[PDB]
C-alpha cells in the first residue's frame with residue numbers, strides 16, 4: 001500500500017504542473033488575441049477611409 | 050495509509066478534469082488568433098495600395 | 099514518387115535534429131554531447147559502457163565529463179562526431195543509411211577541410227548513396243515562405259547574416275560573427291558569482307543553460323530597466339536546483355542576453371547583431387535595400403528570448419533612414435526552421451539532379467563538394 | 473518482408489499539404505488544423 | 506502533444522509490433538514466445554536464447570536469480586557476445602536494457618536484424 | 623513645368639488608355655479560346671491572370687494541345703512549388719524549339735499582364 005501511495009503522489013505533482021502551465025499559456029494567448037483584434041479594427045477603418 | 054489514499058485518488062481525478070478545461074479554452078483562443086492575423090494581413094495590404 | 103525519401107540531418111553546435119524528408123517535424127532532437135566516466139569503478143557484475151552519447155549523457159551528468167564535439171561550428175573531434183551520427187542513424191531513426199540519401203547543413207564561412215572530411219566520412223564509412231551540403235540561412239529563407247530577404251541565424255556556436263534577392267545570393271555581403279549561446283552561458287555563469295552562487299564543473303553548465311532558457315529576456319531600454327531593477331525587487335524570480343536549494347536570479351535576467359547587442363561586455367570589440375545586420379544590408383546595392391528592410395527573418399534558437407524582435411526592430415529603425423518601413427519577421431517555430439527548409443529542399447523534383455553520386459565521389463574524390471555544393 | 477516494410481517509412485508527405493510554414497505551432501496539438 | 510514526440514510514438518508502436526512478430530518466428534523453433542518486447546527482455550534469458558538460435562552457437566548459461574545484479578550480468582553476457590562478432594553498438598549498456606529504455610532496446614533489435622538478416 | 627505637365631498628361635491619357643483598352647479585349651478573346659480548348663479535360667478559367675498563377679492550368683492546356691504526357695505537377699501550395707510548376711511548363715515549351723523572350727517563372731507567378739498575354743499569344747500562334 002505504501003508504494004502505491006507514493007506513486008499516486010507523484011502523478012498528483014505532475015498533473016498540478018501541467019494544469020498551471022496550460023492556464024498561464026491560455027492567459028497570455030488571450031492577451032495577444034485581444035491586442036491584435038483591436039489593431040485589426042482600426043487598420044480596417046483607415047483603409048476604408 | 051488507506052484513508053489517505055482515497056483522498057489522493059479524488060484529487061488526482063479532479064485535477065485531470067481541470068486540465069481538460071484548460072485545454073478547451075486554449076485551443077479555441079488559438080483558432081481565433083489565426084483568423085485574426087489573416088484578416089490583418091489582408092487589411093494591411095489594402096491600406097498600402 | 100518511386101524513390102526512397104531522403105534523411106534531413108541538421109548538425110548545429112548545441113542540438114542535433116534529424117527526420118525524414120517531406121515531414122513537417124523532425125523525428126529525433128537531442129543534445130550533441132559525448133560523455134565519459136571519471137570515477138573509480140566498483141560493483142563488479144554490472145554493465146560496461148565506454149561512453150555516453152546524447153540524451154543519456156544528460157541523465158547521468160554527475161559521473162561524467164561532458165564534451166562538445168562541435169565548437170564554433172567546427173568539428174574539432176571526429177570520433178565523437180561519428181558516434182553521434184551512428185546513434186542518430188541506428189538508435190534514433192532505426193534506418194540503414196545505405197538506402198537513403200542524406201542532407202547536411204553547415205555554417206557559411208568555415209574551413210574547407212570540414213566539408214571534405216564530412217563527405218569522406220559519410221561516403222566511406224556509412225556507405226550512403228548520395229549526399230548534399232546546404233547553408234543553414236538559405237534553408238531558413240526556404241522555410242520562411244519567401245524568396246527575397248535577409249537571414250540572421252544564430253545557433254549555439256555561430257551567428258551569420260546572408261542577404262538573398264530573388265534567388266540570387268551576394269557572397270560579398272555575407273557576415274559572420276562568433277557570438278552565440280555558449281558565450282552567453284559563460285557570461286551568465288561568470289556574473290552569477292556576484293550573488294554568491296558558484297558553478298564550475300561541466301555538469302553545472304547544463305544547469306546554467308536551463309536557467310538561461312527559463313529566466314531570461316531582452317529589455318526594451320537597458321538603462322531604464324536597470325534603474326527599475328535597482329529601485330525595487332519587482333523583477334525577481336526563484337529557480338530551484340536539482341538537489342534542493344533555491345536561488346534568486348533577480349537582476350541578471352536582462353544582463354545575460356544584452357551581450358548580444360553590446361559585445362563589449364564580453365571583452366570583444368565587434369559590433370552587436372543589429373549593427374551587423376545593418377552593415378550587411380548597406381554592403382548590398384542601392385536598389386534592393388528597400389526590399390531587404392521589409393523582409394528580415396530571424397532564425398536559430400538564440401533568437402528565442404522574449405522581446406528580442408521588438409528590441410531588434412527598435413535598434414534597426416533608428417539606424418535605418420526614417421523614410422521607409424522596417425518589418426522584423428520572427429516565426430514562432432524559428433528553432434526548427436533550418437530543418438523545415440531542409441525538408442522542403444529535398445522534396446523538389448529539380449533537386450534530385452543535384453545529389454553527389456557515389457560514381458562522382460569515386461571519380462573526383464572528396465574535392466567534388468566545393469565544385470558541387472554551393 | 474523487405475526494407476520498405478521493416479522500417480515505418482512514411483508514405484505521404486505532410487509538408488506538402490500545409491500552408492505558410494512560418495505560421496506553424498508545435499507545442500499544442502489537439503486539433504487537425 | 507508536440508509533433509516531435511507524437512511522430513516518434515507512432516513510429517515506435519508500429520516498429521514494436523513488427524519486431525515482436527519478427528522475433529516470435531525465430532523463437533518459435535524453441536518453446537518460447539515474447540508477449541511484450543520491453544518487459545520480457547529485462548531478465549535477459551530471452552535475448553540469450555534468441556542469439557543462441559540466430560548465431561548457431563551456444564552461449565554460457567545464464568546466472569540464476571531474480572536480483573537486479575543478476576539481470577545486469579545476464580544482459581551483459583549477450584552484449585559481450587554481440588561485441589565478439591564485430592557488431593558495433595553506441596550508447597548501449599546493461600542498465601539501459603534492464604531499466605527499459607524504449608529507443609535503445611528497439612535499436613538493439615534493429616541492429617541484430619541488420620547483422621543477421 | 624506647364625509643357626512637361628501637358629506632355630505627361632498626353633502620355634497618361636493616350637498611351638495608357640490605348641494600351642489598357644487593347645489588353646482588355648485581347649484578354650477576353652484569349653480566355654474564350656482557352657476555355658474552348660479546355661472543355662475536353664473539363665477544366666475552365668474565370669480570370670486569365672489569377673488562374674494561371676498555380677500553373678496547373680498551363681500544364682493541362684499543353685496536355686490538350688500537344689496530346690502527350692508532361693511531367694506531373696508537384697502537389698505543393700508553396701510559392702516555390704508554383705515556380706516549379708511554371709518552370710516545368712516553360713521547359714516543356716523549350717524542348718520543342720518554341721522561341722520565347724523575357725519569359726520567366728516569376729513573371730507568370732507574380733502576375734505580369736503583358737508577359738502572360740504574350741505567352742498565351744505565343745502558344746496560339748506557334749503551336750496551333
Ligand SMILES: Nc1ncnc2c1ncn2[C@@H]1O[C@H](COP(=O)(O)OP(=O)(O)O)[C@@H](O)[C@H]1O
Pocket residue numbers: 109110111112113114252253254255279280307310311312398399400402403433
Ligand atoms: N526557449 C529558449 N529561450 C532562450 N534561449 C534558448 C531557448 N531554447 C534554446 N535556447 C538557446 O539556443 C541554443 C540552441 O540553439 P540551436 O538552434 O540548437 O543551435 P544549433 O541548432 O545551431 O546547435 C541553446 O544553447 C540555448 O542557449
